[PDB]
């Protein structure tokens, strides 16, 4: 009986996140199609994403439940088709600002996609089902990225005919998004805890660590273009992302098998992997050889994703499902006030306006300071 809302909800998930034109984005933008100087992309367009993401996070979390979860999944499906329709024909610097804002809805409505399964599926088939709707997404993005590089390299297909595939992909994700059964019970509308030492401490690291990761993942495609321009040499943006995401997926899976009490060896295993990111982030900025630049990204994504699993596992050990939304909803929101303040100072045209060349030397110093405060705190 649970196979009907997991076949469609998963089918919607896979096709939505199978976007071949995610890796070849900046090389697509700063090309012969929508020529935009790198100073117009790293300081005027990209920052708008986090501004809109933060604004449309509480209003979409609260709406997602005053209405069903499927309605917001359909609101995320339409915002997938607008964003990628303006990215096809929309040109300028002002239009791309709108595109980012719509992309704010695309990813700020992602809360309504995971949380949907809880309401319509029997409670006992939750942990097992959540894996199906999470493991499928990673398979989609990995399959999408491989397809991008395996075509641009052997098929000689221009970057423009990658967003067409992306638009066709999301356009068929939407067609399914109408068939999920309309849930008949919400969590809060239609149905203090932080005092615990472990929850506050573990959650704080989750907020800080993800805030720096969303920023890197944002401004870590200009750097590759900066070190080796797309118009002068071949770029393996797709292969790197596919291997990187796969590297992350395996790391998350491994943390779920090795049985070690993450209480006495948690903080040390947290700082040790935090200085792996800070030590793997400077490598991006101090090397001229492009190949080394990817190797830094392979380590960073896999290493960090091996920490979010530790944080996620420790946060949710005494919390019931109904509590998940209000503890991973205020972690996903607090982590954005951190990014927005960081993007208004380190990147945005209003603030220091630092270009990408000097920009990564800050994030490398960002993950490095999270270790100093989470390691020297253990004094006596």
């Amino acid at each position: 009986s649970w196979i009907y809302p997991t076949v469609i909800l998963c089918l919607f998930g896979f096709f939505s996140m199978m976007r071949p034109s995610e890796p070849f984005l900046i090389p697509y933008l700063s090309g012969p199609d929508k020529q935009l100087t790198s100073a117009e992309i790293t300081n005027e367009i990209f920052p708008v994403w986090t501004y809109s993401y933060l604004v449309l996070l509480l209003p979409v979390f609260v709406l997602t439940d005053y209405v069903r979860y499927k309605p917001v999944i359909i609101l995320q499906g339409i915002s997938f088709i607008i964003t990628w329709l303006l990215l096809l024909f929309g040109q300028g610097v002002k239009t791309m600002q709108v595109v980012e804002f719509f992309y704010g809805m695309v990813t700020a409505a992602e809360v309504a996609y995971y949380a949907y399964i809880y309401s319509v599926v029997s409670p006992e088939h939750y942990q097992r089902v959540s894996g199906y709707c999470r493991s499928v997404t990673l398979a989609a993005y990995t399959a999408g990225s491989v397809l991008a590089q395996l075509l641009v390299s052997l098929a000689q297909m221009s970057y423009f005919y990658l967003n067409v595939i992306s638009l066709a992909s999301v356009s068929v994700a939407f067609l399914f998004s109408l068939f999920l059964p309309m849930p008949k019970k919400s969590m809060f509308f239609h149905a203090e805890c932080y005092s615990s030492k472990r929850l506050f401490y573990w959650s704080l690291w989750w907020a800080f660590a993800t805030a720096g990761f969303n920023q890197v993942l944002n401004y870590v495609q200009i750097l590759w273009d900066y070190k080796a321009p797309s118009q002068d040499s071949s770029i393996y943006n797709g292969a790197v992302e596919a291997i990187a995401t796969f590297g992350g997926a395996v790391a998350a899976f491994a943390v779920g098998y090795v049985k070690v009490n993450w209480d006495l060896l948690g903080e040390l295993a947290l700082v040790v992997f935090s200085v792996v990111n800070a030590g793997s982030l400077f490598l991006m900025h101090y090397t001229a050889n492009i190949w080394a630049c990817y190797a830094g990204y392979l380590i960073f994504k896999s290493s960090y994703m091996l920490l979010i699993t530790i944080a996620v596992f420790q946060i949710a050990v005494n919390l019931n499902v109904e509590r998940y939304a209000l503890v991973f909803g205020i972690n996903t929101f607090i982590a954005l006030v951190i990014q927005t303040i960081m993007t208004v100072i380190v990147v945005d045209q209003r603030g220091l306006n630092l270009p990408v060349s000097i920009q990564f030397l800050v994030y490398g110093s960002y993950f490095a300071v999270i270790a100093g405060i989470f390691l020297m705190r253990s004094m006596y």
Partner: nanobody
Amino acid sequence: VQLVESGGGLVQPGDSLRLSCAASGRTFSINAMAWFRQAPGKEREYVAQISWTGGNTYYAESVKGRFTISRDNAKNTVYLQMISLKPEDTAVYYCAADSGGIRLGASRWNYWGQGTQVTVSS
């Protein structure tokens, strides 16, 4: 916007020139002005760029170091200063103004100029 280009002429290599672009009619929205070049029997080539609100510039790799593009909003012209011409720089120069606002089209640059001829030979 009605861009009008002038300042071309014939000169030996190693001779500097300045080109202007008197955009006029709809200045209030011009968010860039990038010069373009088309050598005989060839295709348009990127040559320069200048934002209007600020002063960021981005020159083509081949022409960098000798081409400087400077804005003058008071009269709305855009000056491209070129130094050290070579016997393979011969071409015609075109302006390209980005008006502004949300648009759906084939190319970012909305309005273009007519064309000025630069001939470097002996």
